[PDB]
């Protein structure tokens, strides 16, 4: 559920 997946 990270909302901005690319930020991982």
């Amino acid at each position, epitope marked *: 559920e*990270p*909302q*901005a*997946p*690319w*930020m*991982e």
Partner: antibody
Amino acid sequence: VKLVESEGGLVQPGSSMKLSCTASGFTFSDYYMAWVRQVPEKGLEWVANINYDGSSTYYLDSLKGRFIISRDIAKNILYLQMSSLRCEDTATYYCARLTNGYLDVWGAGTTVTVSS
Amino acid sequence: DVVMTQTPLSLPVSLGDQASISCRSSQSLVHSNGNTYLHWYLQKPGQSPNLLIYKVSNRFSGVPDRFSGSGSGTDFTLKISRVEAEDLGVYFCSQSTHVPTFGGGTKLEIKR
């Protein structure tokens, strides 16, 4: 339901301006938010996004930190501070709600023109 | 820098016929968490983009079952069955698996 951008308009090259976006209808701090811009000829470009409480942000690298995304949780407002503008920043700027990687609510857009 | 390439640039279709729009990515869109963050938006004339399909194949609230997204990896397709005039506009794919980027768009034209 509804994001409304501030009036954009004309700014001199090298000067600064701040857009705002007013959120309504949801718990603002339960969603990430983003700014996206569109220039004719052409193409959408992701500008910035921000997490729930504003402790983590992402910016398009080429902006070189000239842009700041922030949110006033107490007033349901999203900001985009833009510094040292060049003509390449002329565009329609959209406020958007970000959920699980996608933009599920978009504002009406506001145009910013960088010109002398 | 992930490039999203859309084919064709413009697509003319008769009312009631099917439109098929291709979107390819230059890198796999399968995130390490297993999700594929590939989405489709429609921008109608004089309007903001709105979300149509998220995560490859999920229809957003309010989108008719006529709109169907499919694909995996680097190859994706949006299919619009039984086209209606109000479907016209520019369809954009977008990825957010990596630093987010958008396709250049495909213009749906209605034949008369």
